[PDB]
Design an enzyme around this catalytic site. Structure first.
Site, PDB file in Angstrom:
ATOM      1  N   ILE A   1      -0.073   4.116   1.407  1.00 11.64           N
ATOM      2  CA  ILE A   1      -0.325   4.793   2.682  1.00 11.64           C
ATOM      3  C   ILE A   1      -1.383   4.155   3.586  1.00 11.64           C
ATOM      4  O   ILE A   1      -2.454   3.743   3.135  1.00 11.64           O
ATOM      5  CB  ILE A   1      -0.713   6.320   2.462  1.00 11.64           C
ATOM      6  CG1 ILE A   1      -0.843   7.047   3.810  1.00 11.64           C
ATOM      7  CG2 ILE A   1      -2.036   6.463   1.689  1.00 11.64           C
ATOM      8  CD1 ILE A   1      -1.046   8.525   3.697  1.00 11.64           C
TER       9      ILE A   1
ATOM     10  N   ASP B   1      -3.639   4.998   6.919  1.00 12.66           N
ATOM     11  CA  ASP B   1      -4.160   6.085   7.733  1.00 12.66           C
ATOM     12  C   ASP B   1      -5.213   5.503   8.700  1.00 12.66           C
ATOM     13  O   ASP B   1      -4.853   5.013   9.783  1.00 12.66           O
ATOM     14  CB  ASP B   1      -4.730   7.184   6.827  1.00 12.66           C
ATOM     15  CG  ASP B   1      -5.223   8.410   7.609  1.00 12.66           C
ATOM     16  OD1 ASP B   1      -5.023   8.485   8.836  1.00 12.66           O
ATOM     17  OD2 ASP B   1      -5.804   9.330   6.987  1.00 12.66           O
TER      18      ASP B   1
ATOM     19  N   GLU C   1       0.870  -1.169   0.000  1.00 13.16           N
ATOM     20  CA  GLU C   1       0.000   0.000   0.000  1.00 13.16           C
ATOM     21  C   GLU C   1       0.898   1.207   0.000  1.00 13.16           C
ATOM     22  O   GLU C   1       2.046   1.138   0.429  1.00 13.16           O
ATOM     23  CB  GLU C   1      -0.928   0.039   1.217  1.00 13.16           C
ATOM     24  CG  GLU C   1      -2.369  -0.415   0.952  1.00 13.16           C
ATOM     25  CD  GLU C   1      -3.270   0.603   0.210  1.00 13.16           C
ATOM     26  OE1 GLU C   1      -4.498   0.537   0.418  1.00 13.16           O
ATOM     27  OE2 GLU C   1      -2.807   1.455  -0.595  1.00 13.16           O
TER      28      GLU C   1
HETATM   29  O1  LIG Z   1      -6.113   4.309   5.646  1.00 14.84           O
HETATM   30  P1  LIG Z   1      -6.848   5.237   4.733  1.00 14.84           P
HETATM   31  O2  LIG Z   1      -7.426   6.414   5.419  1.00 14.84           O
HETATM   32  O3  LIG Z   1      -7.803   4.538   3.821  1.00 14.84           O
HETATM   33  O4  LIG Z   1      -5.706   5.949   3.781  1.00 14.84           O
HETATM   34  C1  LIG Z   1      -4.869   5.283   2.833  1.00 14.84           C
HETATM   35  C2  LIG Z   1      -5.523   4.773   1.518  1.00 14.84           C
HETATM   36  O5  LIG Z   1      -6.296   5.763   0.740  1.00 14.84           O
HETATM   37  C3  LIG Z   1      -5.728   5.753  -0.542  1.00 14.84           C
HETATM   38  O6  LIG Z   1      -6.329   4.919  -1.499  1.00 14.84           O
HETATM   39  P2  LIG Z   1      -7.434   5.729  -2.419  1.00 14.84           P
HETATM   40  O7  LIG Z   1      -8.774   5.660  -1.795  1.00 14.84           O
HETATM   41  O8  LIG Z   1      -6.918   7.105  -2.565  1.00 14.84           O
HETATM   42  O9  LIG Z   1      -7.301   4.915  -3.652  1.00 14.84           O
HETATM   43  P3  LIG Z   1      -6.162   5.069  -4.575  1.00 14.84           P
HETATM   44  O10 LIG Z   1      -4.941   4.307  -4.087  1.00 14.84           O
HETATM   45  O11 LIG Z   1      -6.646   4.477  -5.837  1.00 14.84           O
HETATM   46  O12 LIG Z   1      -5.924   6.537  -4.800  1.00 14.84           O
HETATM   47  C4  LIG Z   1      -4.336   5.393  -0.490  1.00 14.84           C
HETATM   48  O13 LIG Z   1      -4.076   5.260  -1.899  1.00 14.84           O
HETATM   49  C5  LIG Z   1      -4.452   4.206   0.536  1.00 14.84           C
HETATM   50  O14 LIG Z   1      -5.238   3.134   0.053  1.00 14.84           O
HETATM   51  O1  LIG Z   2      -2.995  12.302   2.793  1.00 16.59           O
HETATM   52  C1  LIG Z   2      -3.374  11.510   1.927  1.00 16.59           C
HETATM   53  N1  LIG Z   2      -3.122  11.674   0.564  1.00 16.59           N
HETATM   54  C2  LIG Z   2      -3.580  10.857  -0.457  1.00 16.59           C
HETATM   55  N2  LIG Z   2      -4.347   9.750  -0.273  1.00 16.59           N
HETATM   56  C3  LIG Z   2      -4.475   9.509   1.076  1.00 16.59           C
HETATM   57  C4  LIG Z   2      -5.046   8.390   1.674  1.00 16.59           C
HETATM   58  N3  LIG Z   2      -5.213   8.755   2.985  1.00 16.59           N
HETATM   59  N4  LIG Z   2      -4.736   9.936   3.332  1.00 16.59           N
HETATM   60  C5  LIG Z   2      -4.170  10.373   2.133  1.00 16.59           C
HETATM   61 MG   LIG Z   3      -4.348   3.105  -1.771  1.00 20.52          MG
END
Ligand SMILES: O=P(O)(O)OC[C@H]1O[C@H](OP(=O)(O)OP(=O)(O)O)[C@H](O)[C@@H]1O
Ligand SMILES: Oc1ncnc2cn[nH]c12
Ligand SMILES: [Mg+2]
Ligand SMILES: O=P(O)(O)OC[C@H]1O[C@H](OP(=O)(O)OP(=O)(O)O)[C@H](O)[C@@H]1O
Ligand SMILES: Oc1ncnc2cn[nH]c12
Ligand SMILES: [Mg+2]
Ligand SMILES: [Mg+2]
Ligand SMILES: [Mg+2]
Lengths: 187, 194
Positions: free
Chosen positions: A109, A111, A107
């Site tokens: 990130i 959060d 992944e």
């Molecule tokens: O723990 P969280 O608060 O969920 O934060 C992290 C997630 O959010 C984002 O995915 P996103 O929904 O942006 O999908 P993406 O990877 O396709 O952009 C990021 O890419 C991680 O999956």
């Molecule tokens: O700060 C951040 N930037 C982009 N995507 C994510 C997911 N969770 N938080 C984010």
């Molecule tokens: Mg993601």
């Protein structure tokens, strides 16, 4: 970069850390006898953000001679206030079985961790030889459910970061660096 | 690489080439006035092998101020083999509509062209403002169907190439260079698969 309030990490700093993370991973798996075709390290890259992180990491792992298998998966939201438990719709799952395999979820990130925790519990039920996680950025303070990643490239405050695969309204994924989105911008 | 008969392109070379290709795309799309949010160049990355070229290309494009919106789709053809199945499996399509948008398909390799021929036809009917393709490698001595990509990074001889996203049985995608796989290696594996 006038849409950013600050620079967190440059491509170089990112590169360095990844290589360090990859070396740790390599040592940690030196015993499992990972071999191509029969016993590779399976990287389940969670789309879309992870694509960039995954590309640079599998190459770093390759530097340390770790045979890997890339599996890209695509998940989808069931809708706001529908699950809470982080349940997601599997749009595209792994092409191969992970049963009996050493698997590493990738992944960009972590959060709140709702989705990542759900995925971890899901793949865990498919009986892989082992299951760990590698995440580029960790917002340790943002958890909505308890969750700890095994490998993290960097912990970050609760800022909204973009770049290196991470987006805001599908913008900025292509940046070579990780930066913080200006509040002036996202307003 | 002991499994390799030879290295066609090293990471450095691929890197320089992608860089030059991105400058061309930049210049070419100049008049389109690409802008973030309102008018990004939609990049349709064809998983799985296209993931690495896509990662490095969007950054090279960023170097030239080209705003892009990423789309990952998945289509399967060779499976874990060496030859096209003939058929092309649409397993994942775009998240958003490409209608009215400037679209560029990003592919790791064009050989029989069955894949891209299938893709182009599917997307053409959806009416994007424009539709072009960029292929990292072109094995032009392999078409089953005709196909001319708008941008080619490199032409390759008719040999099985691996590395930089390209696999043989889901293996070698992580290599930094593009190399020729020895037939004795896949031969032994195919036999094992038999
Ligand atoms: O723990 P969280 O608060 O969920 O934060 C992290 C997630 O959010 C984002 O995915 P996103 O929904 O942006 O999908 P993406 O990877 O396709 O952009 C990021 O890419 C991680 O999956
Ligand atoms: O700060 C951040 N930037 C982009 N995507 C994510 C997911 N969770 N938080 C984010
Ligand atoms: Mg993601
Ligand atoms: O021009 P063609 O003869 O159609 O062959 C080239 C295609 O085959 C490969 O995909 P594959 O089916 O092997 O899937 P993958 O990208 O997931 O490896 C390659 O990655 C191109 O998509
Ligand atoms: O050389 C080659 N290596 C990997 N994928 C493909 C598809 N067509 N030709 C191939
Ligand atoms: Mg996002
Ligand atoms: Mg492909
Ligand atoms: Mg393939």
């Amino acid at each position: 970069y006038e849409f950013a309030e600050k620079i967190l990490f440059t491509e170089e700093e990112i590169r360095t850390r990844i290589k360090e993370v990859a070396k740790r991973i390599a040592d940690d798996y030196k015993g499992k006898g990972l071999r191509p075709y029969v016993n590779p390290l399976v990287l389940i890259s969670v789309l879309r953000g992870s694509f960039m992180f995954t590309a640079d990491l599998c190459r770093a792992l390759c530097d340390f001679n770790v045979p890997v298998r890339m599996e890209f998966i695509c998940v989808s939201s069931y809708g706001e206030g529908l699950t809470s438990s982080g349940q997601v719709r599997m749009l595209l799952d792994t092409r191969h079985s992970i049963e009996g395999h050493h698997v590493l979820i990738v992944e960009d990130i972590v959060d709140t961790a709702l989705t990542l925790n759900y995925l971890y519990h899901m793949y865990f039920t498919r009986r892989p030889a082992s299951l760990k996680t590698v995440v580029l950025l960790d917002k340790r303070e943002g958890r909505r459910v308890p969750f700890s990643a095994d490998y993290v490239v960097a912990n970050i405050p609760n800022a909204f970061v973009i770049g290196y695969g991470l987006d805001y309204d599908d913008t900025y994924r292509e940046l070579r660096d990780i930066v913080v989105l200006r509040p002036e911008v996202y307003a």
